[PDB]
Amino acid sequence: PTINQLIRKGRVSKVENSKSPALNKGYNSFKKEHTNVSSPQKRGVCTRVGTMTPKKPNSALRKYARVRLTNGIEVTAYIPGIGHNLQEHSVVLIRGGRVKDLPGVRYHIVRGALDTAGVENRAQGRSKYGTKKPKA
Amino acid sequence: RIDPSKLELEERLVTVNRVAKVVKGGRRFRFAALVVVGDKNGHVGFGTGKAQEVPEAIRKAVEDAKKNLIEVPMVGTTIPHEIIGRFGAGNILLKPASEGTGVIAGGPVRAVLELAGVADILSKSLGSNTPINMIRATLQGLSELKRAEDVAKLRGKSVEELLG
Amino acid sequence: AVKIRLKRMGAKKSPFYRIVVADSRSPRDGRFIETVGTYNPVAKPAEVKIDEELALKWLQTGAKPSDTVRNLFSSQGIMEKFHNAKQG
Amino acid sequence: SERNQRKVYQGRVVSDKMDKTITVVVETYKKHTLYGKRVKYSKKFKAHDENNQAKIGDIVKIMETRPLSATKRFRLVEVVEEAV
Amino acid sequence: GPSWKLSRRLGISLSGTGKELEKRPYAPGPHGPGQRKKLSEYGLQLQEKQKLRHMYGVNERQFRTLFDKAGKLAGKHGENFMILLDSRLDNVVYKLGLARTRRQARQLVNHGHILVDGSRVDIPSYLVKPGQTIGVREKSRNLSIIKESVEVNNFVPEYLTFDAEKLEGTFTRLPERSELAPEINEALIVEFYSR
Amino acid sequence: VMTDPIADMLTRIRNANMVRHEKLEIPASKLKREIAEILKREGFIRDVEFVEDSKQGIIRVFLKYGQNNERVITGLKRISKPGLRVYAKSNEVPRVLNGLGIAIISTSQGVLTDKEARAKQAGGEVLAYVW
RNA sequence: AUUAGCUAGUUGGUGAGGUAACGGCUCACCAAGGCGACGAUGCGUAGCCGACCUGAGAGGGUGAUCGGCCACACUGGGAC
RNA sequence: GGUACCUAACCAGAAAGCCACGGCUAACUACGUGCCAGCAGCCGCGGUAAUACGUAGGUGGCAAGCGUUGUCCGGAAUUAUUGGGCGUAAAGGGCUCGCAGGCGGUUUCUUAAGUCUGAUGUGAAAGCCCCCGGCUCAACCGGGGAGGGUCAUUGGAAACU
């Protein structure tokens, strides 16, 4: 609008969140607080691995991890591969991936982590899902 | 005036919209069309295309194209000055540039300026992304152009006095 | 302390030098006041280019260079023109 | 061989209760680096009055020097115009 | 690559022949004789860019910057970028006739050693200016690659001064785009890499 | 109230263009009288006339319609609003409609056009845009 | 501003001491001022800058390396 | 550091991959499969003919790299000064009296704070950018120049504020 209206209020600029909140904060022990690291990827510990359903028209039951990171925050992640490898108390590296279909989980588990061996018999999609080149 | 049909029209299409209508039984799918039509020597136009098929809508686009053409000034294969057209919620501005700058325009708009022959336009679709009104955003601005020798005749002034 | 001297520039293997009036307290790539022209060691021929006049104003104020810098001035006679001014 | 001239202004006086000193408001005003319109600020200092000839709302010049006390970095030049 | 399987995708004899279109104009593949469709501008301006970059095999890390190096050049930016990739030293070797393919000209720069005003140049991407001489030392003086391609006496372009046994190559003011590219449409690659 | 004198004279010229009136009235201050001679001397007005009255004065304009149906003045635009003083320098003298249009510039050495401010190389306030 | 009241060596003067140097910098005395809706005080936050990246420009983000300067040397305080 | 380098001798011999392939977006078929296994950035794909899952062939992408990931900018004119709004789409305070702040009729003299402009001083160097030269070109490096200041002093201009 008018100019003197703009000067003593300013343009109140638009603040946007991240694509995933639980990658943006790290932990340090003896400080006993909750640092702002903005690291991409973290290694986490699974606690409960049950499975459940997606929400709507797609109805085919998913894999539903629940992982606990090194920040201290327990965020349910997702297992992408064709069948899993994980059991309780494992090493789980997490990249930022949005799952529209499942309610609440916004974290893939990197199939191909330190503990996640690659999915069985996969040729296409080699870099994803952690499989080596089979034989050359 | 009205541009005559004694030209060489090139008439390549832009988009096709399938467009419905709901009767007692069910829907009725027809097709919509719009084709930018002109030469490469300063005459641009179009018409709507409505049919019950694909190719007859392409035919009937050419009719109102030959009913409605419009002419653009081609000073140095540019637009002679800067202008901003504002027809119906799609703003598309028009900026001239040097001759190496090519045709940087929107999707349907790029199939208009090459059908003028004018090859030096910077533009930016401010308004909506709808194909009829963006073409209406171009020719309405191109209608409001002016020529260098013409406005000096309008002012009763020298043409070179408009430059120096 | 005020030593007119070289200044290391250029790539890894082939160096480059700029002849620089500065304080020795600042580091090898440190700051300065005003420079004179160039030095090229990696040319097997010549091209050591000096302003040849501006440092003489600084030598009348007094700024002792190192000898590896100084003998370039002898090759262009800055010091001998300056020694004539000291004999003047 | 004249030495460099110091900072100097003129302005307008709010109060006089300070002992042999006052405040003086400078009203220079500038544009903003984003929009362009030119608004006015308030710039006030502490100025030495060796004669204590000060008034509320007095037009007067100030002249800086070495800092005479805490936040006092000016002396007067000429009492230009007085109040009513 | 195959260097001929990629030009039938473009559907043109890119070196200029009568072959690689006969018996099979459909581009590659089992979806070849299944009749093709009509593309978009993005469908065109890829192939219009790729009808020029597959002439010289330039990877697009090296194709982007030469477009930017035409940006600082004066003149029309379309025809400027025509000059730099026909002042390419790979193209200069091929336009002196001693290579049957421009891919054959790559070994004629890499290890088929060749002398540009001095020692040697192992650079297939050297930007060549007017005022340079090109020769080959006695170590690879007359091999059968050159010996057969001397005998393949092709037409010499009019921006070049070339002899067979003397083997020297110099220039004129510029290679002219009217002489250079009969097939490649310009002014589309610029509007590709402006976006 | 009236908030500025030059705004309500320029749009009054513009609001006569869509109806094609012959004559106008503008209450004619000093800088109002000098804008009108600029448009008169450079091809936008048939003739301008001064009226000496007792109230404040009136200036009147004969609009220039030289051709069939073609308004010479196709729009006006006041820039330096009271609260935004566009001071374009003499290095960056804004020419409008690049090749065609004029902008009136009030300089220290008179209220000038583009051209008379250009060669004399002195800038300042930019009071209007003229198509 | 979902921080509106904040400071008594604070703020003034005089003298004294002290500092390479001006000074509430220190102390006595005397005075009650000073800071504030142009946002004080407070709080969370963070080394700054030539520059880096991006944008067509206006701007926005970052302040790593190389170059400028300040601050710190297990944490804190003093001093030769 | 006998390192760069150059000289001669030797062999197709040492050496390519990941990603995409419904629409965005360049490129498609065959098997497997049957709301299950699985894809998914967006619209959304599979309850038996999946060009969207997985595999194979075949294309296409780019290349010693390619994808994914987290960041920041852009497209985003989607905080809009240049470069939006407010009848119903998000938005007029229920309306007033008004201090501060905001803006000013006409004519004329004057002043120069704003403004305009010169001169001088300065904003180091490296970097961006103008142009050359050097390294087998490039990248890189060098030479010269510009540019960058709501800068300060000084001298001019008087229409507008």
Curated annotation (Swiss-Prot), chain A:
Function: With S4 and S5 plays an important role in translational accuracy. Interacts with and stabilizes bases of the 16S rRNA that are involved in tRNA selection in the A site and with the mRNA backbone. Located at the interface of the 30S and 50S subunits, it traverses the body of the 30S subunit contacting proteins on the other side and probably holding the rRNA structure together. The combined cluster of proteins S8, S12 and S17 appears to hold together the shoulder and platform of the 30S subunit.
GO MF, one annotated term: tRNA binding
Additional remarks: Many streptomycin resistant B.subtilis with mutations in this protein produce increased quantities of a natural (but uncharacterized) antibiotic.
Family membership: Belongs to the universal ribosomal protein uS12 family.
Top-rank taxon: Bacteria
Name of the protein in its database record: Small ribosomal subunit protein uS12
One GO cellular component term: ribosome
Site (Not modified): D101
InterPro entries xref list: NA-bd_OB-fold (IPR012340), Ribosomal_uS12 (IPR006032), Ribosomal_uS12_bac (IPR005679)
GO biological process: response to antibiotic; translation
Keyword check for RNA-binding: yes
Annotated segments matching region Disordered: 32-54
Oligomer status and interactors: Part of the 30S ribosomal subunit. Contacts proteins S8 and S17. May interact with IF1 in the 30S initiation complex. Interacts with BrxC.
Pfam annotation, one family: Ribosom_S12_S23
Assigned keywords, A-Z: Antibiotic resistance, Ribonucleoprotein, Ribosomal protein, RNA-binding, rRNA-binding, tRNA-binding
Keyword Ribosomal protein: yes
Organism ancestry: Bacteria, Bacillati, Bacillota, Bacilli, Bacillales
Curated annotation (Swiss-Prot), chain B:
Family the UniProt entry places it in: Belongs to the universal ribosomal protein uS5 family.
Function: With S4 and S12 plays an important role in translational accuracy; many suppressors of streptomycin-dependent mutants of protein S12 are found in this protein, some but not all of which decrease translational accuracy (ram, ribosomal ambiguity mutations).
Organism: Bacillus subtilis (strain 168)
Effect of G102R: In rpsE9; suppresses S12 mutation K55D. Lethal in the absence of the S12 mutation
Gene3D superfamilies: 3.30.160.20, 3.30.230.10
Cellular component aspect of the GO annotation: cytosolic small ribosomal subunit
InterPro entries, sorted: Ribosomal_Su5_D2-typ_SF, Ribosomal_uS5, Ribosomal_uS5_bac-type, Ribosomal_uS5_C, Ribosomal_uS5_N, Ribosomal_uS5_N_CS, Ribsml_uS5_D2-typ_fold_subgr
Residue ranges annotated for the S5 DRBM domain, each copy included: 9-72
A GO biological-process term: response to antibiotic
Further details from the record: Altered S5 proteins have been identified in a number of mutants. Some mutations in S5 have been shown to increase translational error frequencies.
Any single Pfam family the record assigns to this protein: Ribosomal_S5_C
Keyword line: Antibiotic resistance, Ribonucleoprotein, Ribosomal protein, RNA-binding, rRNA-binding
GO molecular function, one term: structural constituent of ribosome
Domain observations: The N-terminal domain interacts with the head of the 30S subunit; the C-terminal domain interacts with the body and contacts protein S4. The interaction surface between S4 and S5 is involved in control of translational fidelity.
Subunit record text: Part of the 30S ribosomal subunit. Contacts proteins S4 and S8.
UniProtKB/Swiss-Prot annotation, chain D:
Protein name according to UniProt: Small ribosomal subunit protein uS17
Top-level taxon of the source organism: Bacteria
Biological process per Gene Ontology, one example term: translation
Function: One of the primary rRNA binding proteins, it binds specifically to the 5'-end of 16S ribosomal RNA.
GO cellular component, one term: cytosolic small ribosomal subunit
Record GO terms (molecular function): rRNA binding; structural constituent of ribosome
UniProt xrefs under InterPro entries: NA-bd_OB-fold (IPR012340), Ribosomal_uS17 (IPR000266), Ribosomal_uS17_bact/chlr (IPR019984), Ribosomal_uS17_CS (IPR019979)
Oligomer and partners: Part of the 30S ribosomal subunit.
Keyword RNA-binding on entry: yes
Keywords from the UniProt entry: Ribonucleoprotein, Ribosomal protein, RNA-binding, rRNA-binding
CDD domains: Ribosomal_uS17 (cd00364)
Family indicated by similarity: Belongs to the universal ribosomal protein uS17 family.
Transmembrane region(s): none
UniProtKB/Swiss-Prot annotation, chain F:
Organism placement in taxonomy: Bacteria, Bacillati, Bacillota, Bacilli, Bacillales
Role description: One of the primary rRNA binding proteins, it binds directly to 16S rRNA central domain where it helps coordinate assembly of the platform of the 30S subunit.
Source organism (scientific name): Bacillus subtilis (strain 168)
Gene: rpsH
Matching PANTHER family: 40S RIBOSOMAL PROTEIN S15A
Gene Ontology cellular component annotations, sorted alphabetically: cytosolic small ribosomal subunit
HAMAP family: Ribosomal_uS8_B (MF_01302_B)
A Pfam family this chain is assigned to: Ribosomal_S8
Protein name: Small ribosomal subunit protein uS8
Keyword rRNA-binding carried by entry: yes
